[PDB]
């Protein structure tokens, strides 16, 4: 087996990022569902 990978990194995102993401998904949903249902 190969040696441990040297350039291993971990992703992070703070509470502001979570709020931004949730608000984006919900806004896109409320905008587009009106047309999806048709």
């Amino acid at each position: 087996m190969a040696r441990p990978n040297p350039n291993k990194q971990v992703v992070e995102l703070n509470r502001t990022s979570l709020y931004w993401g949730l608000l984006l998904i919900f806004v896109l949903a409320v905008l587009f569902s009106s047309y999806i249902f048709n």
């Binding site: 995102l13 990022s17 999806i36 048709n38």
Partner: peptide
């Protein structure tokens, strides 16, 4: 309109849950 309901539900579940998993891991 079953297709619209399933598409909307998938779009609300998969991405928001995806964000929540990462945030839980961070803290």
């Amino acid at each position: 309109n079953i297709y619209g309901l399933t598409a909307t539900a998938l779009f609300i579940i998969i991405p928001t849950s995806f964000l929540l998993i990462l945030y839980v891991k961070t803290a």
